[PDB]
């Protein structure tokens, strides 16, 4: 069946000039060239018989230097009806556990552990236990404080979720982070549901522990399986996106799995990577034109 390449820039650095899209399509002897968003994203249907690996290296070579992402996939099933998206450093700019640690005066110490867990150098569950234990005693008021003053939504996120919902997709926010954050963040962005770990408290302060059992890599896989079964679909009907090692299970199971702004060891394990685009990249991956977007 037929393949399509999609080139995607960040809308804040929209370097996919018309001449550049034409040069790319000539580089793969393309049948055509379809603009999804001017200066931002185009579709390049590949001639029948080209290996997807060929187009990728060919397009990346032509684009070498420019901050433009490349994805290649079969055209037929590219628009998905499930979104499962990671929260920390994916749909928000921050790591909620690092921002909590700042309130304990321990941001750098905790952030260094978080970085190793993100990269896969330590298992997620013991890293979460270690970091949360350092939050013991923090007043519950800290949560609202952090959300209101230091959490920011990743560009494109609301448009991604809302455009997908407009076209009937079911959308879920998953996280090894905490429900105190995912509940508010899911509501701000517009997700159908969220699932995360739970911080334990004595009613006034954090205990420094997480509700058992701890949700990590396999929990994100299991949630994708649960959603797909519940909506009468399969994981192949889902697009999954995350940034960290603990997202690779759902990224690999989903029909379309995207490593977003991930560091090399993680992006190396995903079939699609978006290093330059924002979350609108996931709409272009699915073939949406900007005219389709919820504005």
Residues 55 and 41: their CA atoms lie apart, in Å, by: 16
DSSP 3-state assignment of 32?
coil
Task: Find the binding residues for Mg ion in span 70-99 (CB under 5 A).
Answer: 86, 88-90
Token pair in block for residue 149: 């003053």
Query: Residue 84 has which token pair?
Result: 């499962």
Asked if omega into 213 is within 30° of 0 (cis), the reply is: yes
Integer-rounded Cα Rg, in Å, for the chain is: 20
Query: Is 275 known to be catalytic?
Result: no
Q: Which stretch binds Mg ion (CB under 5 A): 24-32, 129-137, 218-226, 236-244?
A: 236-244
Quick one: CA dihedral 22, 241, 279, 119, positive or negative? negative
> Binding site residues for Mg(2+), as ranges?
86, 88, 243, 247
Which position among 98, 243, 275, 278 is part of the footprint of Mg ion (CB under 5 A)? 243
Stretch in the footprint of Mg ion (CB under 5 A) among 43-51, 155-163, 237-245, 278-286: 237-245
Which one of 72-80, 202-210, 239-247, 273-281 is the stretch in contact with Mg ion (CB under 5 A)? Answer: 239-247
Q: Is 88 a catalytic residue?
A: yes
Query: Are the CB atoms for 59 and 23 separated by under 8 Å?
Result: no
Q: Provide the minimum distance between the beta carbon of 116 and Mg ion in the complex, in angstroms, as a whole number.
A: 13
Q: Which is nearer to Mg ion, 86 or 98 (CB)?
A: 86
Token output for 53: 């690996």
If binding is defined by CB under 5 A, does position 244 make contact with Mg ion?
yes
Query: Which residue is catalytic, options 39, 43, 56, 86?
Result: 86
Kindly identify the residues of this chain, within the stretch 89-148, that bind Mg ion according to CB under 5 A: 89-90
Of 165-224, binders to Mg ion (CB under 5 A) are none
Interface positions with Mg ion (CB under 5 A): 86, 88-90, 243-244
Residues taking part in catalysis: 86, 88
């Amino acid at each position: 069946v037929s393949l399509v390449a999609t080139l995607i820039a960040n809308p804040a650095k929209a370097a996919l000039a018309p001449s550049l899209g034409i040069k790319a399509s000539a580089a793969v002897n393309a049948t055509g060239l379809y603009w999804l968003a001017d200066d931002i994203a185009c579709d390049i249907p590949l001639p029948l018989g080209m290996e997807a690996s060929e187009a990728d290296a060919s397009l990346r070579a032509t684009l070498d230097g420019a901050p433009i992402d490349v994805v290649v996939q079969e055209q037929e099933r590219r628009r998905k009806k499930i979104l499962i998206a990671d929260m920390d450093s994916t749909m928000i700019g921050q790591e909620c556990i690092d921002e909590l640690a700042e309130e304990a005066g321990l941001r750098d110490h905790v952030a260094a552990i978080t970085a190793r867990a993100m990269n896969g150098e330590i298992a997620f569950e013991p890293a979460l236990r270690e970091r949360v234990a350092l939050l013991k005693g923090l007043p519950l008021s800290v949560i609202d404080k952090v959300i209101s003053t230091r959490i920011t939504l990743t560009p494109g996120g609301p448009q991604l979720v809302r455009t997908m919902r407009k076209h009937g997709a079911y959308t879920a926010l998953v996280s090894g982070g905490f429900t105190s954050f995912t509940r508010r963040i899911a509501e701000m962005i517009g997700f159908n549901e969220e699932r995360a770990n739970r911080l334990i408290d004595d009613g006034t302060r954090l205990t420094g522990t997480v509700a058992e059992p701890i949700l990590g890599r396999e929990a994100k896989v299991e949630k994708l399986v649960e959603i797909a079964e519940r909506v009468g679909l399969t994981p192949e009907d889902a697009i999954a996106v995350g940034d960290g090692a603990n997202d690779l299970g759902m990224i690999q199971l989903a029909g379309t799995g995207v490593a977003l702004h991930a560091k090399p060891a993680v992006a190396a394990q995903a079939k699609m990577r978006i290093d330059h685009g924002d979350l609108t990249a996931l709409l272009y991956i699915q073939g949406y034109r900007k005219a389709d977007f919820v504005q």
